[model samples]
Target: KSVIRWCTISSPEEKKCNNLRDLTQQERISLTCVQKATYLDCIKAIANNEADAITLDGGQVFEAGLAPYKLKPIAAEVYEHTEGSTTSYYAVAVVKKGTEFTVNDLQGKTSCHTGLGRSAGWNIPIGTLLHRGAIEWEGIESGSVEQAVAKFFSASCVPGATIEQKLCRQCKGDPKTKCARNAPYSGYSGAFHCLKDGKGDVAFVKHTTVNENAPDQKDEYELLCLDGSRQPVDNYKTCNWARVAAHAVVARDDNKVEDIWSFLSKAQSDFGVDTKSDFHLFGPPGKKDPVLKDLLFKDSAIMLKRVPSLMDSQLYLGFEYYSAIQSMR
Candidate 1:
């Protein structure tokens, strides 16, 4: 057996995979599990023989230059957590298999992405759908998840929030069906699609869609939901071509995408060690490239404060670290 050591970025699921000792009944599946390491570190671990593999989203793997060792003829593409999922994350709206219309019928029915303004979240999905001639959303206003769900529509993001902020309250109405923005490898949630009321036809809902101010159920409403239990995406995995991806895993062999894919598939069960440090551990909001930095994340401290749970603790404060003492209001 190819003994594999596993590590992953900040995904909450990686944390659970780390606990395999307990989850697997101490089977000693992999030798060890490391969590919260940057994708680079994970790659280094493999090269240095410290870890065997790492786990991350599909797009990340493709961009990392580790495409050689990819395990072909693989198993299903496991999906967990739906709320934080967007076209950026490569989440697709699904109806039950054999239900009809190949993953495409979601046109003009009201789908969603991370948020409105985000390129990955809204723009990508919108463009993808438009390109395929499946759906349209030119006039849809900023109706929050609650508002949309109440109308039998799903919500993905804040309609105008950053990618990260989009995670948090997806699938509020139903616990089992709603996707949580936890992680891809492993966690309380899985990154896959869902169905609403067996319709195989619902809106793409975001996590924070159901807030206190969300529209009441008194109004007829329904949010889209994922349908199956870990529908596979290995063979059919599509190209994400995301504008900005945060993490990456390097190649130990310099031609190990196959190995990386094998490692990730196995590492999927490996949980992260430091989920709390997620905000800092992974790529920060927006692409880190200097030219792109100005584009990602929101500029509102007020909004940052509003979503402290998502942002790093105390990050909402000015960069001065309360040291420069920039006249605190």
Candidate 2:
């Protein structure tokens, strides 16, 4: 049972998974890399017992914990917070100084997002908007959320979006890769860069992106307050769109979670950020693409904590975040 089959959704993710396995092999804790076409496929593979584990956004966790798969989150990622550490991050709207925009003025504005359907980049914001009646959806179906979002914004670079109605307008990738998961501006850093390059009026990203990318220029950007005011980036605690749960390593519910957690403990002990080794468990070192910020785990993650008893997707998502996801569907 020491052998853990980790899931990878793309070529880049597969490479990182293989590298982790390579490092673990030297450490003598067995791991096998399993590649799938999409995160949904990874979930299916885990449910069928073909794969053992995979990290997921809060949105993905909810879907994985749905009826057919019923996967459980085994461990949570730890990230920077004022109170030592927290398994959460704030989703904030970032805009450059003098953009003269407020949260309420988002209508018909250009936008940047990490990826379509992602928790911070999409679900939370859209869900909150719909809940607030900011978006008019009297009797719409589940699949038209993209269309609705597209109409709300003048144009957006929501990587992985399927529609053509200005949703992918700000993307930089060419031909087949444009507006896709592999788009040049597809992740948190990419989304920030999209806004920084003057391509988008606002960027939906996690709290740390601006500081990570523009450390000395923190004052050059500001956060949009909930009350249509503007505040400094450091004030994200009060100005953020929503506080989202950290990504989790979700696994099948059949007790295989322990094995997955067991291996991560050993791996983190040997290769987590605090330790020095040929690899770093949290951040991908020497990844070919400089923009591929977070790999299997979030770049800022400090540790992996096992989820306690009864901490399924809903519990891990908490009442507010879980209800937001529910309202979306």
Candidate topping TM-score: 2
lDDT per residue, candidate 1, 1-329, as tens digits?
33345565444435544444244344433335665334445545555667555433322333233343332111112112235322122323322333343334443243333323222333334444444444432233553323322233233322222233223234232343233222120110111122323322332322212211122321233222223132322211332222232112233443344544444434333322223432322222221221111111111001110111222211222233211112110
* TM-score of each prediction: 0.32, 0.93
Model 2, range 1-329, lDDT digits (tens) per residue?
A: 36899988667667878888877775545899988866888999999999999999888899999989999898999897888999988999899999797878889989998887788888877777887777766544645788888878899999888765498988886867767775778777788888988889998888888877777888999988778899999999888888889899998887667678778999899888777776777774222342456778877788988888589899999988887777666
User: Candidate 2: deviation at residue 143, Å?
Assistant: 6.2
Top lDDT prediction, candidate number? 2
